[PDB]
Every structure is written in C-alpha cells, then in structure tokens.
Amino acid sequence: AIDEIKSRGYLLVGLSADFPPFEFVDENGNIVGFDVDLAKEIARRLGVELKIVDMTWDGLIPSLLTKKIDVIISGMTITEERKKVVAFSDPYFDAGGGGSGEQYGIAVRKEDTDLLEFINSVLRELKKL
Numbered sequence: 001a002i003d004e005i006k007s008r009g010y011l012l013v014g015l016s017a018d019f020p021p022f023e024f025v026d027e028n029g030n031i032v033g034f035d036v037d038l039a040k041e042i043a044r045r046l047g048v049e050l051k052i053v054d055m056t057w058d059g060l061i062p063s064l065l066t067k068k069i070d071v072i073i074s075g076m077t078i079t080e081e082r083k084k085v086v087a088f089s090d091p092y093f094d095a096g097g098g099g100s101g102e103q104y105g106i107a108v109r110k111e112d113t114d115l116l117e118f119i120n121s122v123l124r125e126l127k128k129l
C-alpha cells in the first residue's frame with residue numbers, strides 16, 4: 001500500500017465535512033479542521049500531496065473497502081463492531097480524557113498493514129510532542 005501511494009504521488013483521505021471542529025467547510029468553501037491538519041501531516045511524512053475526498057458519512061467505509069480512498073480521517077470512533085470490517089490506527093483524539101469515552105482513529109483496510117504501521121509511527125511521533 002505505501003509504494004502505490006508514493007507512486008501515485010498523493011494520499012486519498014475520505015471524510016464527511018459536516019463535523020466541526022474535525023472536518024468542516026469554512027466560509028470560503030474550503031475543507032478544514034483537525035482531521036485535515038492530521039491528514040496533511042501524514043501526507044507530508046509520506047512525501048506525497050494530499051487529496052481530500054468529501055462524501056456522505058455512510059459513504060466512507062464503502063469507499064475505503066472499494067479502494068477509492070486510502071484512509072478515513074473523519075472523526076471516527078474506534079469500536080469493536082467496526083474492527084470486524086476495517087482496521088484502526090492508535091487513537092488520536094480522546095473525547096473523555098484519560099482514554100475514557102469515544103476515541104477517534106484513522107481507518108485503514110485490514111490488508112494494508114504497512115500503511116497502518118506507518119500511520120501509527122506518525123501518530124506516535126506527534127504524541128511525543
């Protein structure tokens with residue numbers, strides 16, 4: 001998965017831009033927010049451009065499974081149910097503090113274990129700061 005993204009020259013991140021402050025569309029029509037910033041960080045570290053694909057919430061896992069996006073970064077709670085279908089990064093946002101509550105993760109296809117590893121190393125470096 002990594003070599004393919006690097007050859008393509010961009011990282012395709014799906015989200016649903018209706019969830020400020022994680023992703024939303026600002027007053028100039030730009031998609032912005034915490035998840036966009038994180039997506040940019042990951043893309044930079046991969047040495048690729050970022051392409052954000054905005055879609056309806058329900059569209060995201062399908063698009064991931066069918067390879068139209070590489071990852072979901074869209075305020076998605078890590079849950080045991082969803083782990084039946086996708087893999088999740090380490091948590092990057094804790095809604096409750098102390099790891100209580102919803103923890104958000106980056107969803108990746110289960111077979112893309114190299115991508116998942118890579119993302120985890122970026123989250124681990126960012127948390128070190």
Ligand SMILES: NC(=[NH2+])NCCC[C@H](N)C(=O)O
Nearest residue numbers: 016018019057074075076077
């Ligand atoms: N971009 C969005 N609409 N995100 C909604 C996230 C809601 C909730 N954290 C979930 O994972 O279902």
